[PDB]
Design a protein around this ligand. Structure first.
Ligand SMILES: Nc1nc2c(ncn2[C@@H]2O[C@H](COP(=O)(O)OP(=O)(O)OP(=O)(O)O)[C@@H](O)[C@H]2O)c(=O)[nH]1
Ligand SMILES: Nc1nc2c(ncn2[C@@H]2O[C@H](COP(=O)(O)OP(=O)(O)OP(=O)(O)O)[C@@H](O)[C@H]2O)c(=O)[nH]1
Ligand SMILES: Nc1nc2c(ncn2[C@@H]2O[C@H](COP(=O)(O)OP(=O)(O)OP(=O)(O)O)[C@@H](O)[C@H]2O)c(=O)[nH]1
Ligand SMILES: Nc1nc2c(ncn2[C@@H]2O[C@H](COP(=O)(O)OP(=O)(O)O)[C@@H](O)[C@H]2O)c(=O)[nH]1
Ligand SMILES: CNc1nc2c(c(N3CC(=O)Nc4cc(OC)ccc43)n1)CCC2
Ligand SMILES: CNc1nc2c(c(N3CC(=O)Nc4cc(OC)ccc43)n1)CCC2
Ligand SMILES: [Mg+2]
Lengths: 123, 425, 423, 427, 431
């Protein structure tokens, strides 16, 4: 069964039917799009904001490392200074005490001498 | 008038566009300067005050070197700078970047250039949209554009020429993701989509043109012949498929199942005349389909035969008789078993010096068969393999896409598969 | 997507960086006075990816040269192509990093890093479309390792949307420069997991082994190792620099090579191996551990993704045939849940001195072996706290050491997890 | 940039400084007046506007006889008079006098002169302090100096070149006391101390140089080569350079374990009628060529720093060191995956004309941190214990203000140091 | 540490002091008029240790001459080199101490001591860097022993940070019949234990024994004895006076020689032994000098060194000879004789060589021992002390001047304590 359909200046068309059908009959707004694109942009920006927040926390750790080394140097200086002043003072006192004892023994001998000369006149 | 506006998105879409517009110019006698010594060609070409004929086309590719092909090519004087939209970085093979990041940035500009073309039309039929499944731009931006065209041109037809991926020639591992993402989002917004399997075209150029390693130019020149066959009666005063809505009338009884199988013949090597019956037999050989699938694993819903050149009806009906007797062409049962035949008298044309020979008569068969769901299944399997491990998903999510869009797109394809099965029983 | 900013940091960084610029300047036809004298316009179509074009029709590498020590950058100026680099792109300190990651990353590097970033930023503003950053450096030393990872982090903070790419040289006791290489490398591996997008693992262990075993160099020198590095760096950058079927860029590289963000450490490989050739044979060195620039056996794991570059005149069909033939015979060594995970590019421009060459960029789970080797060396030192005081003296806590190695042992576990995963 | 300040303390420190600065001048072409007909000699020499190159050095001694010989010698114009600092009375072999009684009288002047040298540095690397363990000034005044440097300069690198006592050439019986006392108080203030054993230097001069009774000038000239090998990396632009921080990082695994062992080769008689890179490397692991008497085969290496000078290519060092890694007799600790640090400077070693050392095309100085150096601490500690058990001579220290508690505290510190060397050698 | 201030007190002190100055003046090339007529600048490099440089290119001994008896300094003034001494440095009293320690220390000596301090202060204040003092004196008389120890005490009070060195002549019944010399010596030794840093024990018993037994002097005179003293004093002060590898001073001597404050009494020895004005027909060999130095026949204290142990030893070899060979023999004598050196003072023998020999000898060796055998000297004095004190013999000679018995008991207790701690260290083990 051939059914002519159309004829025109540059062609013609028809329908060839070999067997008829067994069964008769056949058995997002602009605002919605724009919101979805804007939501995806906000998720990008959030993700990027979170990246930069982690890198900024790393910067502050770096500052805290560098500061800590400066504090260790400063407290190394402060303890070295304290202990050296303590040693030098304790050593000074000690040496002065030894010298003062040596002279006090010598001066006791000196008074004994005057007692010897006195006993001589007494007799 | 019945103007159609062509939109080419991504590199594949732009380069196949180059091939088709060159072929249109050869068929209508339009020189590379836009000048020209049947007025149906005005559906695809406007005319300027200098008397030059300008394609009703928009090219969208965010890498300037691709668009530079158009503006420095042989037919560059055909095009005006407002037809060419480019950017800095492309979508980096990432659907999410094409759809969301690039898409939000360029969509209004792209629609503005389309609107400028549409304002020049008096009876705009709709849009022919050329793009890849696998490219980040071809997939991601095309789907955003299709949504927006549905909003902005609600009653207008939208046809796709879609490059279905072949790993042999693709350089992206993530193409199955992009193909499912863009199919899901575009599904409700396209009236008729002709898929072209790069693997199918590659095999045809190797087998029938004796080219060891076909170039993109090889593939694209063969693709242009198919597109030209499909658009011939829009650009000439033919009889079958004389406007865009007729494609859905003749091929798409069910809206979701809108993916016709194209078969083309003959493809003869230039460095090498077949009968109506021989080229008609070739339309029922799977080796000549534009998508790899087995029609015996499906039923037809619709079938049209588009003849070009020296074709006389007695010779066609003779060929159809001999096929029906020898072979079982199973239609669904709510559909008549039959063929709509059109002959366009304009002779098939080839690029001079190309690898396609000039033939006296050609034919393109457009059939809606449930068998094309095999192409969807191959894609869905590769999708599933990678998505089970969430491989590469973080590149899409990093661009603002929600992970659940993967699952939502993949469910849609499952439903598409069951829709095809239900229809085929 | 055009310009790459290349940075080279520390002694290894500047030596292999200089060799890189030597080799690719020759391929692109650029003499040391920046003047082009080549024979083909394939050499200039994409030359802006790596070179700035100055007034006198001359090309200047988009390269920034960084060190805390003025010495090795003085020896690069004196080198063959020393006069090609922009003089104000030399950013050098005076007092060195003391082989100490903590010094390069914290105190000394901080003092120099903002000077480098100013030069980085002047180069980034003269870019039409900045692809990202390519850094060369060692992980075993102080400046390239400590200050390079500091540079990476600050660059990420200022350019969070640009790709970060490193050539990171891994230390080996077989060719060491300092006793604390295991600490320096482990602290840096933790930084690269978190902050780079693509890292080529250039393993001195494997370079030495290639020279000793395959090349018969009983005593390999850095010159011998760096001949392998410069051959590799040329090969992996091919598709960035020349027009071809694949016009690659650093973001497409990441998208297709990195299925999971932490797993971005590549095994480079090269054939033929040479000291200072058929297609099927070239294809087979993909699985040859003898051709890997990371001391790992690819047959010890599975390929997530692979990039192959073939260079020279040769049939692209024969290449595609052999590549597929190797993939199928070796199917057990590719993950099944990434289909079509090998991509091949061919480029007709051979490297100097070779007619044909092959280069492989593998994302292999066998890379865990490199990191296990470093981990074991880290642990043998750290369990005895050997040399630790030089790092805590810089303000570092011990916990940064344990955190860095547990992150690295996690990377190892993550690579093991996908090695065992099934479809 | 990168300056190092040298401080020479007491007779030993000053006389070795004489040998070192003389050698530096010949190595750099500087004439005795500081004038000279590679910029890195400026790390050790400041320069006046008259073109005069002045050592970044202070010479200190509590008695003037030794420094007077500098003030009237060949290089009397090399230094500014203010760099040569002497008191009147020395420490009379008594640490307590060097550190307290006599040293306190001159310490502020020395620190003032050092601060003026620091003011001339744009990137000060640190201090090299030259001294004997055994003398009263070398021990007690160095301790005071180091403590004062820590206060003024914090953790800024301080390294030492130290003369470990040898009875054959020493003229003090209290040297074991002075040695242990200065080691105790200096421990926490020094980053790294290169120890030299006068006995080892003596035996090398006899054996290798055919000298029956080596003089101080004989020993000092050999010690000068070792010092020059170490500082050459900072004074010359060589291929492989090692700066002060890199010495500390690569030789000191723990803060207290900071006494590397120097070895030098070749030591050839000038009158005798070229050793390879492999040969001179191997000689550095020969126990005879050590600069401290100890047996490395008795212990485990923790770090080897090899400093080459002259005609030496990196390949040959690599082959030389690869052989060393195969010798089972050279044992490294469990916890040291890699222990070698290499330096190559390309200026050959220079010998003083009229000296006994032969001119050679290449030479190497190895600094090794070995647990075997504990033996030398053991020898000193035992001599300390012998006398201290009887409190022999302790009254001379107590009379100058010290307490007995400092002796036992110092000796207990040395006992812990011996236990530390044992511990780091366990597997 | 440059200048030494020399003081000589009493007859013995001024006689041995004068001989000291004649001998070292000849060694440094100074004639009796103070002019330098020597042939080597080695003689002048450290000549300031003992000499002040005066007006006419002159050298004046830094020497203070003291005696309660006026005639002893007339003897000095007319002795050879009597004119070399500064005239203002002669401090003379009117009446000697009658061999009475108490007169020297408490009464007559105390009236003259401030006049001595006048001279001592002017010499000491003119010093650029004062090492300290050396005192020559006998312990058995009254002036040298009593006023000598009084001087030490008084000088120590003003110069407590300077070294106090003394050459102390111990009495012997073989040389003097004065029965109270054990008393004067014991009272002196008490003072020396507490107020000197270094004391050379010059034992008249040893000097007589050497003269009688070795020099075959049937009747030795003080001139004979003093020849051995002056040779000893030249030798022990060699490293103070000449430039050498060891530039010694009095404090480095004390630090290295004195392990315990009280045990600072040295046993000197000399080789070769010679009589005065006697040609030496053949010099001696280095190993001869080395062994003979440690021989009891060559000790200036009447103690056998093999009866105790050396705490510390200083040896001075003088003349042209091999320093290799000298170290060789010194190491040998130490190793073969290891039992006579304490083990717990390591490396306790130190040797100097000086190429300038003393006059009349081509080679010489001088020995300074801190030996525990020196307790034999103090035990000898202690026994003589007790034999008189138990009888309280002659005590009124001392209580007549104001002393008490208890001061005798105390000094005897202190010397016997000294003997005990020598014995303690003689028996001490390193285990
Ligand atoms: N038939 C044909 N296919 C092509 C052509 N160019 C690319 N393709 C295919 O298209 C897919 C890649 O998609 P494209 O549209 O070219 O890429 P794109 O979206 O412009 O690029 P990106 O934004 O970087 O992702 C792959 O399957 C390619 O094989 C072409 O010229 N012809
Ligand atoms: N190598 C070498 N060692 C020396 C030299 N001079 C002295 N010594 C050694 O140093 C130690 C003695 O310490 P000195 O440096 O001479 O004494 P000092 O630091 O000047 O201290 P006092 O003189 O006690 O105030 C002994 O072990 C000597 O052998 C020298 O010129 N070279
Ligand atoms: N070796 C030596 N001993 C002497 C000499 N002169 C006196 N002696 C000894 O000195 C002790 C007597 O003391 P003197 O020095 O003569 O007496 P002093 O110190 O001058 O005191 P007085 O004469 O009592 O006022 C006795 O042991 C004498 O043997 C001498 O020239 N040489
Ligand atoms: N392949 C190669 N490795 C090197 C080179 N120079 C140094 N290295 C390695 O780099 C590490 C030492 O770090 P280095 O770059 O020299 O120190 P930095 O200047 O602190 O960055 C060790 O693993 C060395 O083996 C080189 O030229 N080539
Ligand atoms: C940067 N140089 C470079 N060289 C090459 C490639 C490559 N990429 C980027 C691209 O575009 N595709 C791709 C896909 C892929 O699948 C697993 C792997 C790698 C890449 N990049 C592929 C061949 C050589
Ligand atoms: C005063 N004349 C003198 N002569 C000499 C020495 C000496 N001293 C001083 C010194 O510096 N060291 C020393 C160490 C020592 O060990 C047991 C013993 C003695 C001294 N002094 C030693 C040689 C001759
Ligand atoms: Mg001294």
């Amino acid at each position: 069964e051939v059914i002519e359909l159309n004829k025109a200046t540059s062609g013609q068309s028809w329908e060839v039917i070999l067997k008829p059908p067994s069964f008769d009959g056949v058995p997002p707004s602009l605002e919605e799009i724009q919101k979805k694109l804007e939501a995806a942009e906000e998720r990008r920006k959030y993700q990027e904001a979170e990246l930069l927040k982690h890198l900024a926390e790393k910067r502050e750790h770096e500052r805290e490392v560098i500061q800590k080394a400066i504090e260790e140097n400063n407290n190394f200086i402060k303890m070295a200074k304290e202990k050296l002043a303590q040693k030098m003072e304790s050593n000074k006192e000690n040496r002065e005490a030894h010298l003062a004892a040596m002279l006090e023994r010598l001066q006791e001998k000196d008074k004994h001498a005057e007692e010897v000369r006195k006993n001589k006149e007494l007799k | 008038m019945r103007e159609c506006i062509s939109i080419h998105v991504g590199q594949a879409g732009v380069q196949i566009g180059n091939a088709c517009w060159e072929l249109y110019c050869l068929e209508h006698g339009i020189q590379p300067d836009g000048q020209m010594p049947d007025d149906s060609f005005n559906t695809f070409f406007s005319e300027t005050g200098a008397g030059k004929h300008v394609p009703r086309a928009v090219f969208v590719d965010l890498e300037p070197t691709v668009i530079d092909e158009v503006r420095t090519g042989t037919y560059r004087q055909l095009f005006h700078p407002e037809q060419l939209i480019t950017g800095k970085e492309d979508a980096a093979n990432n659907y999410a970047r094409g759809h969301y990041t690039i898409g939000k940035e360029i969509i209004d500009l792209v629609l503005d250039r389309i609107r400028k073309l549409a304002d020049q039309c008096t009876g705009l039929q709709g849009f022919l949209v050329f793009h890849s499944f696998g490219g980040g731009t071809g997939s991601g931006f095309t789907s955003l554009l299709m949504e927006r065209l549905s909003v902005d041109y609600g009653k207008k037809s939208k046809l796709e020429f879609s490059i279905y991926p072949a790993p042999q020639v693709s350089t992206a591992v993530v193409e199955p993701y992009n193909s499912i993402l863009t199919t899901h989002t575009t599904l409700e917004h396209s009236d008729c989509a002709f898929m072209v399997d790069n693997e199918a075209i590659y095999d045809i150029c190797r087998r029938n043109l004796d080219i060891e390693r076909p170039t993109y130019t090889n593939l694209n020149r063969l693709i242009s012949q198919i597109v030209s066959s499909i658009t011939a009666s829009l650009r000439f005063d033919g009889a079958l498929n004389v406007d865009l809505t007729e494609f859905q009338t003749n091929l798409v009884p069910y809206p979701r199942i809108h993916f016709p199988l194209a078969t083309y013949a003959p493809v003869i090597s230039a460095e090498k005349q077949l009968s109506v019956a021989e080229i008609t037999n070739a339309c029922f050989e799977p080796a000549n389909q534009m998508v790899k699938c087995d029609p015996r694993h499906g039923k037809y819903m619709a079938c049209c035969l588009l003849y070009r050149g020296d074709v006389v009806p007695k010779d066609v009906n003779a060929a159809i008789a001999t096929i029906k007797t020898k072979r079982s062409i199973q239609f669904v049962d709510w559909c008549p078993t039959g063929f709509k035949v059109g002959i366009n008298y304009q002779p098939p044309t080839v690029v001079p010096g190309g690898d396609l020979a000039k033939v006296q008569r050609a034919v393109c068969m457009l059939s809606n068969t449930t068998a094309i769901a095999e192409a969807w299944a191959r894609l869905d399997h590769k999708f599933d393999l990678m998505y089970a491990k969430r491989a590469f998903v973080h590149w899409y999510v990093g661009e603002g896409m929600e992970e659940g869009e993967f699952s939502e797109a993949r469910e849609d394809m499952a439903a598409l598969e069951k829709d095809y099965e239900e229809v085929g029983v | 997507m055009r310009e790459i900013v290349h940075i080279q940091a520390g002694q290894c960084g500047n030596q292999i960086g200089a060799k890189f610029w030597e080799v690719i300047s020759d391929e692109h036809g650029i003499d040391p006075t920046g003047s082009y004298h080549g024979d083909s316009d394939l050499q200039l179509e994409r030359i802006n990816v790596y070179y700035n074009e100055a007034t006198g029709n001359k090309y200047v590498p988009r390269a920034i040269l960084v060190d805390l020590e003025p010495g090795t950058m003085d020896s690069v100026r004196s080198g063959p192509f020393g006069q090609i680099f922009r003089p104000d792109n030399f950013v050098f300190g005076q007092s060195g990093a003391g082989n100490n990651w903590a010094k390069g990353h914290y105190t000394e590097g901080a003092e120099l890093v903002d000077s480098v970033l100013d030069v980085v930023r002047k180069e980034s503003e003269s870019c039409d479309c900045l692809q990202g950053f390519q850094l060369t450096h060692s992980l075993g030393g102080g400046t390239g390792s400590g200050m390079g990872t500091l540079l990476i982090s600050k660059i990420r903070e200022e350019y969070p949307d640009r790709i970060m790419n490193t050539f990171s040289v891994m230390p080996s006791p077989k060719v060491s420069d300092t006793v604390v290489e295991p600490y320096n490398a482990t602290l840096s591996v933790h930084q690269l997991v978190e902050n780079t997008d693509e890292t080529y693992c250039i393993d001195n262990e494997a370079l030495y082994d290639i020279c000793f075993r395959t090349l018969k160099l009983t005593t390999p020198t850095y010159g011998d190792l760096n001949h392998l590095v410069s051959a590799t760096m040329s090969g992996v950058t091919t598709c960035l620099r020349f027009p071809g079927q694949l016009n690659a860029d650093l973001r497409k590289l990441a998208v297709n090579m990195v299925p999971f963000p932490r797993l971005h450490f590549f095994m480079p490989g090269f054939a033929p191996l040479t000291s200072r050739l058929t297609v099927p044979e070239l294809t087979q060195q993909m699985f040859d551990s003898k051709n890997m620039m990371a001391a790992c056996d690819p047959r010890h794991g599975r390929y997530l993704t692979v990039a192959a570059i073939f260079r020279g005149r040769m049939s692209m069909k024969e290449v595609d045939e052999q590549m597929l033939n190797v993939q199928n015979k070796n199917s057990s060594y590719f993950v099944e849940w990434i289909p079509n995970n090998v991509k091949t590019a061919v480029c007709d421009i051979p490297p100097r001195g070779l007619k044909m060459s092959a280069t492989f960029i593998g994302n292999s789970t066998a890379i865990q072996e490199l990191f296990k080797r470093i981990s074991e060396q880290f642990t043998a030192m750290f369990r005895r706290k050997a040399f630790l005081h030089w790092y805590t003296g810089e303000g570092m806590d011990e916990m940064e050491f344990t955190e860095a190695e547990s992150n690295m042992n996690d990377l190892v576990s993550e690579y093991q997890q996908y090695q065992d995963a099934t479809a």
